Amino acid sequence: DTRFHSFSFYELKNVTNNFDERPISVGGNKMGEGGFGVVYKGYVNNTTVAVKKLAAMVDITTEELKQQFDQEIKVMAKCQHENLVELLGFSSDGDDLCLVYVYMPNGSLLDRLSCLDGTPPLSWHMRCKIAQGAANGINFLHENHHIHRDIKSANILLDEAFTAKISDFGLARASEKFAQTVMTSRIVGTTAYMAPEALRGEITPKSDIYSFGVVLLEIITGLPAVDEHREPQLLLDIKEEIEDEEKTIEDYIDKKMNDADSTSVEAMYSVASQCLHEKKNKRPDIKKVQQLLQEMTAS
Ligand SMILES: COc1cc2c(OC[C@@H]3CCC(=O)N3)nccc2cc1C(N)=O
Numbered sequence: 001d002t003r004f005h006s007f008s009f010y011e012l013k014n015v016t017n018n019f020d021e022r023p024i025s026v027g028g029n030k031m032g033e034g035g036f037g038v039v040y041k042g043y044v045n046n047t048t049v050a051v052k053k054l055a056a057m058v059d060i061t062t063e064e065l066k067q068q069f070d071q072e073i074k075v076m077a078k079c080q081h082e083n084l085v086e087l088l089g090f091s092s093d094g095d096d097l098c099l100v101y102v103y104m105p106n107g108s109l110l111d112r113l114s115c116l117d118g119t120p121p122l123s124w125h126m127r128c129k130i131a132q133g134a135a136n137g138i139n140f141l142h143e144n145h146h147i148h149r150d151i152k153s154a155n156i157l158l159d160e161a162f163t164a165k166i167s168d169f170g171l172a173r174a175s176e177k178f179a180q181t182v183m184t185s186r187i188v189g190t191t192a193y194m195a196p197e198a199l200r201g202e203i204t205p206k207s208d209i210y211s212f213g214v215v216l217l218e219i220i221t222g223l224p225a226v227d228e229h230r231e232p233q234l235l236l237d238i239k240e241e242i243e244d245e246e247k248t249i250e251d252y253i254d255k256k257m258n259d260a261d262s263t264s265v266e267a268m269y270s271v272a273s274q275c276l277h278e279k280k281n282k283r284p285d286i287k288k289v290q291q292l293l294q295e296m297t298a299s
Pocket residue numbers: 031032033034037039049050052085101102103104105107108111154155157167168
């Protein structure tokens with residue numbers, strides 16, 4: 001139960017060069033974006049920070065956007081951990097709602113897997129630490145009775161040491177009876193990562209495990225979760241191709257690595273495969289996932 005800094009909108013507007021939407025690669029301040037806002041690089045109190053300015057980028061109301069702003073703050077006040085991005089403050093005065101975070105110099109796992117802007121590919125050694133760190137962050141959330149509901153590589157940020165930091169808690173849901181699955185009338189999340197039961201309205205921590213399985217496939221292959229000009233379009237379908245012996249995990253391993261070994265790659269794939277079980281009750285819990293990922297690098 002934390003209390004955060006309250007920033008003025010105009011200081012955040014000033015330190016981000018009037019919310020310069022041009023990418024940093026061309027002299028702007030934009031680091032990235034989501035369906036609910038744009039992230040800008042800022043400089044407050046000599047400290048580099050990230051400023052997420054909330055906007056209706058997809059079909060969403062002002063009231064729903066304010067609820068996600070409040071929910072992010074509420075979750076960040078309760079959940080502080082090594083593998084969760086740190087909220088420094090917020091801005092609720094003036095024109096837009098802003099959320100200020102600790103600066104993540106290596107951006108998102110999605111951007112690093114795609115080598116966006118010419119960044120060097122992540123080694124298998126770094127990818128293993130990222131998978132372990134992301135699982136430790138999800139474990140902390142589930143231990144504190146929170147369901148993220150939007151686990152994906154755009155929501156796994158990378159700090160100055162490539163430590164994984166789960167981000168975007170605007171859709172997170174608390175549950176005193178952590179088990180006991182409930183339903184919602186507003187289905188939210190990212191389609192390419194969503195569990196079948198989440199697509200139907202169910203709210204359960206088992207859906208976070210399924211989404212994490214898609215993230216593990218992106219880590220192994222370097223492929224995005226969805227690509228409309230690829231066969232298969234959805235990355236999750238490669239699990240079925242491998243099960244039906246049409247292909248092997250070796251046919252899909254990211255070629256942009258030089259230090260992957262068959263044993264640890266097959267160990268990570270086995271975890272991803274278990275996470276992606278269509279029946280939610282057959283998936284492992286996050287504790288089991290954490291254990292399997294630790295055994296993957298043990299020697
Ligand atoms: C929340 O803080 C950041 C979000 C970044 C980002 O986000 C893409 C989506 C939208 C919001 C989200 O959480 N994921 N892409 C690239 C770089 C980012 C850096 C930070 C940062 N803290 O430096």
